[PDB]
C-alpha cells in the first residue's frame, strides 16, 4: 500500500530534468523497493536509476539494481530487462547479485524455466524482497504456453513451472481456465489455436482502390 503514494512524486521526477544528473537516487530507489514490496511496476523509475548508474559509474548499487532486474523479470514479456541490460556496463554485470539475476533473466526470457529454477538459489535474499516474484515468474511461464501452445502433458506443465508434481500444477492449471484431457493431458487451448493465419484474406483489392482509379 505504498505504490500510488510515491507514484505522484516519481511521475513528476521522470517527466522533468531530474533523471540525467545523479541527484535523485533517494526517491526512485525507494520506489523500486516499493515496486518490489507491492508487485506493481513503473518502468521509467527503474530506467532513470539505470541511466544515472550508466552515465556516471560512481553510484552503481547492488540491492536496488537487483530489485530493478527482478521487477523487470516479474513483468515479462515487457521490454524491462531489455532496458536493464541497455545501461548496466559489463564491469557492473559481474557483481552479486546483478550477474546472477542477469543469468536468471537470460534463462527466463528465452524460456529455459527448468535450467532457471535448477541453477537459481531456491531461497535467495531478494526473491522474497520482491513480493509475488514466484507468482509473476510462473505467470510468465504460463503466458507463452497460453499464447503459443495447444495441449500439455501432466508432468510436462509441472516441469515447465519447475519443481512441482500435482499440487501447484493444478493451482496454475485451474487459474488460467485450463481443463483436463483423457489419458492424459492438461487442456491449455484447442487444436485450432495453432495455425492462426494472419493474411491469406488479401485481394478484395478492388472497391476502395477503384475510388483512386475513377479518375
Amino acid at each position: 500500500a505504498m505504490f500510488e503514494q510515491m507514484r505522484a512524486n516519481v511521475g513528476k521526477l521522470l517527466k522533468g530534468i531530474d533523471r540525467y544528473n545523479p541527484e535523485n537516487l533517494a526517491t526512485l530507489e525507494r520506489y523500486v523497493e516499493t515496486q518490489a514490496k507491492e508487485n506493481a511496476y513503473d518502468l521509467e523509475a527503474n530506467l532513470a536509476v539505470l541511466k544515472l548508474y550508466q552515465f556516471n559509474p560512481a553510484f552503481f548499487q547492488t540491492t536496488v539494481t537487483a530489485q530493478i532486474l527482478l521487477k523487470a523479470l516479474t513483468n515479462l514479456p515487457h521490454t524491462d530487462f531489455t532496458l536493464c541490460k541497455c545501461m548496466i556496463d559489463q564491469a557492473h554485470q559481474e557483481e552479486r547479485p546483478i550477474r546472477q539475476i542477469l543469468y536468471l533473466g537470460d534463462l527466463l526470457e528465452t524460456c529455459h524455466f527448468q535450467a532457471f529454477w535448477q541453477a537459481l538459489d531456491e531461497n535467495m535474499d531478494l526473491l522474497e524482497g520482491i513480493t509475488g516474484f514466484e507468482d509473476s515468474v510462473r505467470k510468465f511461464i504460463c503466458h507463452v504456453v497460453g499464447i503459443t501452445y495447444q495441449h500439455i502433458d501432466r508432468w510436462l506443465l509441472a516441469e515447465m513451472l519447475g519443481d512441482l508434481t500435482d499440487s501447484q500444477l493444478k493451482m496454475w492449471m485451474s487459474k488460467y481456465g485450463w481443463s483436463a484431457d483423457e489419458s492424459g493431458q492438461i487442456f491449455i487451448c484447442s487444436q485450432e489455436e495453432s495455425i492462426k493465419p494472419k493474411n491469406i484474406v488479401e485481394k478484395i483489392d478492388f472497391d476502395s482502390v477503384s475510388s483512386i482509379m475513377a479518375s
Binding site: F206, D207, S210, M213, A214
Partner: protein, 181 residues
Amino acid sequence: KLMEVCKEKDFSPEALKKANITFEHMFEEVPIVIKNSHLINVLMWELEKKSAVADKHELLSLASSNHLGKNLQLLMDRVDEMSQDIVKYNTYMRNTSKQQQQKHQYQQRRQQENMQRQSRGEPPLPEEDLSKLFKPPQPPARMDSLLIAGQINTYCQNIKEFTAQNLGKLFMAQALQEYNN
C-alpha cells in the same frame, strides 16, 4: 497557343522556336450537350409514343447491348491494338530520343573535340578547319514537330488507357456486386 505562334508548327525549324514559349497541345476539349434546346419537345412526343403502346423499338435498343459483350473482345482486341500502338509509337519515340541525343550531345561532343584539338585556330592565318567544322546535324533543336503529335499521340494512349481503365474497373465492379448469389 497554336493560333498565336504561326505558321504553323514547322518541323526542322519553327518547332522548338515555338516550344520555347511552349504551345499547349490539348486545351479546351469543349463540352457538347447540356440544355433542353427545344428541338426536343417533338422528340419527347416520339419518346412518349415509343414508351407507351409501341414499346418494341425502345426495348430493341435496350436488348441490343446484350450481344456487344457476348462475343466482342471489347477489352482484348482494343488493349491489343493500343499495346501495338505503344510498341510502335512510344518505342520509335524512344529511338527518336536516342537519335536527337546521337546529334545534340553525342556527335556534338566530338565536334567540340574537333574544335579544341587544334588550339582553336592559328594566329597569323585561318582558322579554315574551326569554321569548316561544327557541321550542324540535321536536328539542331529537338525535332519538336514529330514530338508535338508525339506528346498528343502518347496522350491518345493516356485517354486510351483511361478507356482501358473504365472498361475493367466498372465491369468487375458489376461482377463482384451482382453475382454474389
